[PDB]
Design a protein around this nucleic acid. Structure first.
Ligand SMILES: [Zn+2]
Ligand SMILES: [Zn+2]
Ligand SMILES: [Zn+2]
Lengths: 216, 636, 87, 446, 349
DNA sequence: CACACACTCTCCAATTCTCTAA
DNA sequence: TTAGAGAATTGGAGAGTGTGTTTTTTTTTTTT
């Protein structure tokens, strides 16, 4: 719907202007565009990530920070796209072999006091949470597809650049092009990222008396 | 729901064994009547009140403990009449769609609950005390209205179909109907019904009382009911033990026949045979796989399944099975029959026929008339027979009335397609009344009185002189249909035809009886040759298929008529049929063939005649396959 | 497709039908007086076999119920009066 | 309406009835109504008075009483037991409704004790299927009690009619036609768990008792199933007489139904619609209607004590020098040692256990030790005590098991998990533990 | 509006009766009045104090005692063990709109409040549970042997259409089967569907196994056990090894696995929990009343309190005053501390 | 996946309704 | 009046669609 696309574009523009306009310092000393310069230096170093503080975002635009707290799954995609285009306008022109723009991972952090694993009740679902713990296990790095292309097995038609939802959730392949399951996923024409599952044990200070330590 | 709940709960509260009514309970029952009068077509208020069980919870205690409050009491009576109204009246007809049929079933279920609740004797005690006062008083419009509504309440509670899934009750366990009848007996309302039937002062209620009596007697038949002596319980104990013994021995014999049919080796014990002299459905010989013991009595349909005959082609089946009522109820009902036949029959039946003459009766009340005409006449025939107590219905007028009703039901069965089964059930009632009148005119010849012998000869002379009573049997046989009429109809028709032909034979062989109907000449064998038709023999064979389940009298009648039709008229070739020969094969192969000596001897006689004809020529086998008209004379 | 047999008059006047039934009892023999049950068993066995060969789909009693009605039709009746006597 | 007032309105009635079973029903009802005890009148009316209680639903009937009533009836019940059993339950329901206090939905059960003939476990051939049978065996394992759906109440999802009393057999079966005659539905049904009826259910593994085991043969085991009041009365290790009927139980995993799908070395049967292309195997199960031992509180004492027992215990209480009389009677084989006999008698009588205000117990049981040479009667005292008293235990100081006088912890390979094996003192809880060779314990027990 | 009634007389079953609108409203009003008018033996308004102590700590769960519910409102105590799910839902609604009368802004803290019934007198041994107890409120005791983690369970699920953006409206999840839409009302596509993970409402779930306590009846016999389901705030009320006392609805459902295991139509059973106490933690600070605190702090004013406490340890033991003193000091215990945030020392004696 | 349950959907034909001749 | 030929209505057989499918290390208690 055009209204929905307008909402997404407006929120993306607001995140873009946050990354373009945010400053730290005073007129008595000087100003540095914190996230502009972080984006530029990280992209030129080939890092392709930044670390947006929730308190800074709240100070610039409290509504964006509240939306990102309540609905991070929706709005982090817009924030990452905003960071990508800000990186484009901040870095270009680029030398040979660096013409194609790379995706930017917008990590984020907060000064707020953290919650705990046993405090994570059902009402915290799909919200931002901040919990401490100890890593007890760490998986080997495995590849997860972020975009795929699927080719019909019978007639060799192709659907390309299907956006995969982030996280451990998957994607449902269409049942219409042919057979009931017409498609296979093309192993070459898909883009993947590293992912790693961890087990986060509750802090021994945080375990209630007589309990075993939970893990998440 | 909420307003109805508030208004019904407003009535009263029950404390232990006592009921306390709120002061506005009269206005409350009036409100309930108002809701019932403004139901939806789904009978929603009746459903909701039945679900709430307000009748059992409130109205029965109010009836049994606050009948002194007369303005409340009559409103309660009217409310109970409206609630207990039969479902067929509530919906107009038996529905044919799922939703409305469900609504019908729900209302019917609550009627089951009402009938179960009304067996409490105090309800009919109060009703009988009230109606006793009313009939002592009898007179006002309100008074006769209250009498009518009490009688309609009794009619309504008697007239519910018993839900025999829940009333799945054994030989003489007391059903809900039995308990209701026993409550009527203990309350003494049976005496009030007898008073209404015997009294000449209030004959307008005679039709209603006939309906009450017809609904009282439903499981019972008069021949069994009249024989219930005081010492019957011990006899029935020994009879039950004997019946269990013979049933168990029969089952053991059947088990051993099955065991010897199959081999003593296990199922997968293989081996296959070829029968060299027997062609398969192809050109090669048949290969048999089920073993020598199945070959010992080989049949070419061992592995086959029956055919799915369509719904419009399936035969009709019996709507009832003969569970007896409890023995105490049977004794009470026998006493009621005795007192009704002695004190009540002639005046009540004359009053009901007068009601039919005045034509204020409902559209099918002559069915009740013919029910009573069958039932109490047969009760009189059982035990000590006395035509004086039952003299009124021996008139020729009753024969004419039965004949016109039976022909009307016959025509409506042939025309009114949508209601043909009910017309068949009405024609069956008329046929039963006709049969019982033939039985009683047969019976009274044995009596020692010359006056009733004269009356018998008068009745026989005019009934056999008038042709329409005579040709009706050929009409019924020619348009009998198993698809619409149950086997009991055919059984009664065969019994009636045998009795009628017996009496006609005796009358023609003892007296001239030379003319019929405008007189025209008549002889007996001319009429008997009318029954030499394919349809008649087909129907008789159809009843003969159930020879094990048939009564001994039915087997005697069917074999006697078929032997008459084959031997005396010399038309054995009419009975040559291959279905008939399959019937004879099962009859001869029966292990119980010794119990059916007349049937097996008749089968051997007709088979010997067939094999004589077959030895004459091979055409007999082909002619045996197809039913056959008067061209059968070639074979004879 | 849908080559379902029917058992109408054309089936009954086929070679396996009444023309066969005219001849199936040529091999048969009967004992006669006082053994009508055994002769009946042989008779029903032969005609049951004939019915099975003619139209295997039905049980014998159901086949008889079908055919006793089906004989009224004019085609099989004309073939009947041909089989009776001779052509 | 006409006198032909019945179009078969709303009827799906039984077009045929089991004659033998219904005759058995009525004759068994007559037996319950008319068979009388020698010391009174109408025994089973009095015994059926107890069925109004919420927990009670089973009437225990003596088969020899049934034989004394009528031999043909008893033979028919014995030969046709599984066929006729629900009809007998209906007879009991008809008999017990005259108490007038029963719930309308309550099921009642008949349980035949005192069957004259007892069969071995080896004799439970397929020929015994469905017959009333009595067996003796030793219980090995008892499973948890469950509710078993005896008859479902279902709702038709596309005409909202309820269908009651849907009998089940073994697979969970919803009805296969709607009770509403014009309704076309044959699959879309919903169980009403609240208005459905359940019975308590337990299965127990038994094996051949020690007397019945053939020489040089593995013990044969059998699955017995107990219902209603019998669902915990037998425990593992007990030697019990079971009466009931050997039944055949299908491989329910192979059967698909409108209610539920299938859940998938010998061949088995084939060809059923519900079975599909699979093949159904069978196994033998003994459906026990009654269980008893093979050889057998203040309110309980007051009820059990008959007048002779009251007079006897009263005379004993007033018996002067009951001390020496009980010492002599309890230890007749012992010569002398009157003080020891008195002490052990006081051990049998014991003191009063008490609980302090702070919820801490004070011991009431006394403990007695008898030191002596191996040539003396110290073992004789323990043997007499353990022969005399019920619930007592005899043991050596050395353990004949991993657990000894006290519990020990052992793995079981059914879970590879630790559990406690009970010791002699726990087996002698609320009783007497006789411990010979007391000086030679292990350190754990000591 | 719907009119008030005598409640105990009706032609319906209890579940049907309390489901109907009229008596439901009457039950609601009665429980509301009971909460707002019940008093202690000394005359203290009990549930005002309990609701204040709940709303201070944001515990969103109100504990009610059966032994005085029966005293105040008879018919509510009558219907409660017979139709517990329905009556407890009605109690939850009434308690919620009492709490929103006492603390009108408490809907900001929680939108739903659970009434937890305690001291239910119809206690049952765990192995004595039978079909007679089905769908009725029971109380049992046992040791917790196993616990799942706290898991989110669907409670009010909205499904995204399998072929378009539409959200199919809320389905109330059951404990018997996963509720499903069938086909979408905006476009009748059918079969599989996606859960809207953001708009779907979840609830806390924890399934525990409890068996008979080892010393209760298991004298060498194996102990019987039952599964129980804890929902919403009842999760983390117990851990393995806890000698709990559990009140709950004895609930049963069809289980094909049990059917094939037993070869009979055997229905699985589970206890839908409604209250969890512990038989060792007979008193807790979360249950202390203001009167208890007042009389405790009055006792501390006495100069003899040390001697009273020492004399109060094991009062059925004579002498050993030094032992009682040392045990009192250990029973009360010292104060743990960590000076500098880098150096722990124990407080226990 | 290729071989079985369960459901929907399509057209063939099986049986009855109505008009006509014998 | 009774029975056979042409037209109309509904049962269900068959095709298509959708769905379902011993052996090693580490611990713990008890046996010697
Ligand atoms: Zn394709
Ligand atoms: Zn239905
Ligand atoms: Zn859609």
């Amino acid at each position: 719907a055009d209204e929905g696309q307008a909402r997404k574009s407006q929120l993306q523009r607001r995140f873009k202007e946050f990354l373009r306009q945010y400053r730290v310092g005073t007129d008595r000393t000087g100003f540095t565009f914190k996230y502009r310069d972080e984006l530029k230096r990280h992209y030129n170093l080939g890092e392709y990530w930044i670390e947006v503080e929730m308190e800074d975002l709240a100070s610039f635009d409290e509504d964006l920070a509240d939306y990102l707290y309540k609905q991070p799954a929706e709005h982090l995609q817009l924030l990452e796209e905003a960071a990508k285009e800000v990186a484009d306008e901040v870095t270009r022109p680029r030398p040979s072999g660096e013409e194609v723009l790379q995706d930017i991972q917008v990590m984020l952090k907060s000064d707020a006091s953290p919650s705990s694993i046993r405090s994570l009740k059902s009402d915290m679902m799909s919200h931002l949470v901040k919990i401490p713990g100890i890593i007890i296990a760490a998986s080997a790095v495995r590849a997860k597809a972020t975009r795929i292309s699927i080719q019909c097995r019978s007639c060799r038609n192709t659907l390309t650049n299907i956006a995969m939802r982030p996280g451990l959730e998957g994607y449902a392949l269409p049942r219409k092009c042919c057979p009931l399951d017409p498609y296979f996923i093309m192993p070459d024409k898909c883009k993947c990222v590293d992912f790693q599952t961890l087990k986060l044990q509750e802090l021994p200070d945080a375990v209630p008396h007589g309990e075993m330590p939970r893990h998440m | 729901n909420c307003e109805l709940l508030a208004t019904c709960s407003a009535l009263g509260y029950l404390e232990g064994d006592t009921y306390h009514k709120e002061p506005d309970c009269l206005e409350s029952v009036k409100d309930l009547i108002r809701y019932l009068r403004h139901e939806d077509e789904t009978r929603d208020v009746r459903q909701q009140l039945g679900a709430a069980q307000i009748l059992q919870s409130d109205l029965l205690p109010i009836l049994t403990q606050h009948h002194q409050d007369k303005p409340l009491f009559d409103a309660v009576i009217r409310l109970m009449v409206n609630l207990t109204q039969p479902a067929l009246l509530c919906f107009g007809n038996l529905p044919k769609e799922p939703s409305f049929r469900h609504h019908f079933l729900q209302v019917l279920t609550y009627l089951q609950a009402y009938k179960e609740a009304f067996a409490s004797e105090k309800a009919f005690g109060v009703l009988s005390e009230t109606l006793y006062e009313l009939l002592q008083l009898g007179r006002q419009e309100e008074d006769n209205l209250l009498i009518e509504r009490i009688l309609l309440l009794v009619r309504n509670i008697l007239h519910v179909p018993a839900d025999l899934d829940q009333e799945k009750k054994i030989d003489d366990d007391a059903s809900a109907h039995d308990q209701l009848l026993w409550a009527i007996h203990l309350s003494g309302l049976d005496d009030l019904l007898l008073f209404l039937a015997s009294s000449s002062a209030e004959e307008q209620w005679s039709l209603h009382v006939l309906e009450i009596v017809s609904l009282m007697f439903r499981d019972q038949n008069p021949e069994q009911l009249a024989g219930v002596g005081q010492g019957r319980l011990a006899q029935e104990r020994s009879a039950d033990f004997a019946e269990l013994e013979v049933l168990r021995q029969r089952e053991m014999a059947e088990k051993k026949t099955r065991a010897l049919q199959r081999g003593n080796r296990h199922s997968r014990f293989g081996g296959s045979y070829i029968v060299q002299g027997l062609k398969s459905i192809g050109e090669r010989d048949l290969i048999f796989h089920k073993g020598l013991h199945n070959l010992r009595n080989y049949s070419s349909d061992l592995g086959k399944q029956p055919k799915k005959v369509p719904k419009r082609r399936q035969a009709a089946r019996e709507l009832s099975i003969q569970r007896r009522s409890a023995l105490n109820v049977r004794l009470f009902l026998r006493d009621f029959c005795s007192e009704f036949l002695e004190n009540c029959y002639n005046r009540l039946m004359g009053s009901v026929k007068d009601h039919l003459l005045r034509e204020k009766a409902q559209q099918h009340d002559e069915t009740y008339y013919m029910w009573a005409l069958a039932f109490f006449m047969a009760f009189n025939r059982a035990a000590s027979f006395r035509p004086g107590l039952v003299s009124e219905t021996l008139s020729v007028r009753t024969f004419h009335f039965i004949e016109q009703n039976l022909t009307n039901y016959y025509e409506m069965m042939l025309t009114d397609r949508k209601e043909a089964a009910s017309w068949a059930r009405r024609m069956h009632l008329a046929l039963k009344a006709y049969q019982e009148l033939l039985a009683t005119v047969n019976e009274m010849d044995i009596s020692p009185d010359e006056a009733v012998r004269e009356s018998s000869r008068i009745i026989k002379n005019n009934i056999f002189y008038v042709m329409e009573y005579r040709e009706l049997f050929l009409a019924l046989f020619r348009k009998f249909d198993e698809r619409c009429q149950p086997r009991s109809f055919l059984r009664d028709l065969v019994e009636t035809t045998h009795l009628f032909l017996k009496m006609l034979e005796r009358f023609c062989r003892s007296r001239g009886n030379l003319v019929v109907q405008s007189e025209k000449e008549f002889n007996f064998l001319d009429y008997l040759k009318r029954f030499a038709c394919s349809t008649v023999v087909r129907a008789y064979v159809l009843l003969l298929r159930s020879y094990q389940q048939n009564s001994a009298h039915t087997n005697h009648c069917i074999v006697k008529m078929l032997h008459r039709l084959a031997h005396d008229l010399k038309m054995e070739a009419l009975l040559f049929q291959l279905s008939v020969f399959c019937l004879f094969n099962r009859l001869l192969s029966d292990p119980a063939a010794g119990a059916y000596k007349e049937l097996v001897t008749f089968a051997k006689y007709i088979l010997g005649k067939f094999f004589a004809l077959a030895a004459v020529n091979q055409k007999a086998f082909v002619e045996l396959l197809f039913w056959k008209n008067t061209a059968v004379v070639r074979e004879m | 497709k849908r080559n379902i047999p029917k058992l109408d008059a054309q089936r009954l006047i086929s070679e396996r039908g009444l023309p066969a039934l005219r001849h199936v009892f040529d091999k048969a023999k009967f004992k006669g007086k006082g053994h009508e049950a055994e002769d009946l068993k042989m008779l029903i066995r032969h005609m049951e076999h004939w019915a099975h060969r003619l139209f295997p789909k039905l049980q014998f009693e159901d086949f008889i119920d079908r055919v006793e009605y089906l004989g009224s039709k004019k085609e099989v009746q004309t073939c009947l009066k041909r089989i009776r006597l001779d052509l | 309406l006409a006198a032909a007032a019945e179009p078969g309105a709303g009827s799906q009635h039984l077009e045929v009835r089991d004659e033998v079973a219904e005759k058995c029903q009525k004759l068994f009802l007559d037996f319950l109504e008319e068979f009388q005890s020698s010391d009174g009148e109408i025994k089973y009316l009095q015994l059926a008075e107890e069925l109004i209680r919420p927990e009670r639903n089973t009437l225990v009937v003596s088969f020899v009483d049934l034989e004394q009533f009528n031999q043909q009836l008893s033979t028919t019940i014995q030969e046709e037991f599984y066929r006729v059993y629900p009809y007998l339950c209906r007879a009991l329901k008809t008999f017990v409704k005259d108490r007038k206090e029963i719930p309308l939905a309550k099921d009642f059960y008949v349980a035949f004790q005192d069957l004259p003939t007892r069969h071995k476990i080896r004799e439970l051939t397929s020929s015994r299927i469905g017959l009333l049978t009595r067996i003796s065996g030793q219980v090995v394992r008892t499973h948890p009690v469950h509710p078993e759906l005896v008859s479902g109440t279902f709702l038709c999802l596309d005409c909202q009619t309820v269908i009651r009393d849907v009998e089940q057999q073994f697979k969970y079966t919803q009805p296969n036609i709607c009770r509403n005659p014009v309704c076309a539905n044959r699959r879309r049904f919903l169980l009403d768990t609240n208005k459905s009826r359940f019975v308590d259910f337990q299965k127990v593994r038994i094996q051949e008792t020690q007397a019945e085991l053939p020489r040089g043969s593995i013990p044969r085991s059998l699955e017995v199933i107990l219902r209603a009041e019998a669902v915990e009365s037998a425990q593992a290790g007990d030697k019990c007489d079971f009466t009931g009927t050997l039944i055949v139980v299908p491989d329910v995993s192979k059967l698909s139904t409108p209610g539920a799908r299938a859940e998938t070395e010998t061949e088995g049967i084939r060809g059923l619609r519900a079975l599909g292309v699979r093949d159904l195997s069978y196994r033998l199960v003994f459906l026990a209607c009654c269980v008893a031992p093979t050889n057998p509180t203040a309110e309980s004492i007051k009820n059990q004590m008959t007048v002779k027992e009251w007079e006897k215990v009263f005379e004993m209480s007033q018996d002067k020098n009951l001390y020496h009389n009980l010492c002599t009677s309890l230890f007749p084989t012992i010569h002398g040692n009157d003080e020891v006999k008195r002490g052990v008698l006081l051990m049998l009588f014991g003191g009063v256990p008490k609980t302090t205000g702070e919820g801490t117990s004070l011991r009431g049981d006394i403990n007695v030790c008898i030191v002596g040479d191996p040539s003396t009667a110290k073992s004789q005292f323990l043997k007499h005590v353990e022969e005399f008293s019920p619930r007592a235990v005899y043991t050596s100081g050395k353990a004949s098991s991993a657990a000894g006088l006290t519990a020990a912890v052992v793995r079981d390979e059914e879970s590879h998990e630790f559990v406690i094996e009970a010791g002699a003192l726990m087996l002698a809880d609320n009783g007497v533990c006789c411990i010979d060779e007391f000086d030679k314990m292990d350190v754990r027990d000591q | 509006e719907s009119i008030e009634n005598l409640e105990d007389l009706k032609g319906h079953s209890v579940r049907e009766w309390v489901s109907m609108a009229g008596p439901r409203l009457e039950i609601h009003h009665r429980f509301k009045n009971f909460l707002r008018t019940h008093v202690d033996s000394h005359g203290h308004n009990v549930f005002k104090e309990r609701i204040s102590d709940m709303c201070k700590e944001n515990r969103e769960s109100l504990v009610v005692n059966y032994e005085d519910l029966a005293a105040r409102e008879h018919v509510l105590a009558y219907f409660l063990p017979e139709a517990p799910a329905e009556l407890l839902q009605i109690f939850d609604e009434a308690a919620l709109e009492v709490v929103l009368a006492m603390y009108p802004k408490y809907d900001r803290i929680t939108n739903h409040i659970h009434v937890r019934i305690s001291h239910l007198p119809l206690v049952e041994e765990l192995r004595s549970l039978r079909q007679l107890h089905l769908n009725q409120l029971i109380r049992t005791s046992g040791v917790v042997t196993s616990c799942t983690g706290v898991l989110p369970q669907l409670s009010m699920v909205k499904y995204n259409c399998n072929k378009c953006n539409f959200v199919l409206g809320p389905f109330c999840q059951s404990q018997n089967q996963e509720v499903k839409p069938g086909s979408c009302p905006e476009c009748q596509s059918a079969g599989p569907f996606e859960v809207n993970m953001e708009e779907t409402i979840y609830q806390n779930y924890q399934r525990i196994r409890i068996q008979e306590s080892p010393g209760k009846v298991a004298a060498g016999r194996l102990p019987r056990s039952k599964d129980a389901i804890l929902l919403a705030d009842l999760v983390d009320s117990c851990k393995p090894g806890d000698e709990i006392e559990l009140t709950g609805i004895y609930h049963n459902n069809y289980d094909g696995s049990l059917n094939t295991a037993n070869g009979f139509p055997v229905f699985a059973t589970v206890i839908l929990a409604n209250h969890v106490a512990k038989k060792d933690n007979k008193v807790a600070v979360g249950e202390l009343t203001d009167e208890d605190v007042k009389m405790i702090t009055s006792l501390s004013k006495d100069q003899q309190i040390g001697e009273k406490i020492f004399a109060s340890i094991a009062p059925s033991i004579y002498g050993h005053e030094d032992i009682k003193r040392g045990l009192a000091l250990a029973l009360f215990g010292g104060e743990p501390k960590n000076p500098g945030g880098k150096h722990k020392v124990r407080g226990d004696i």
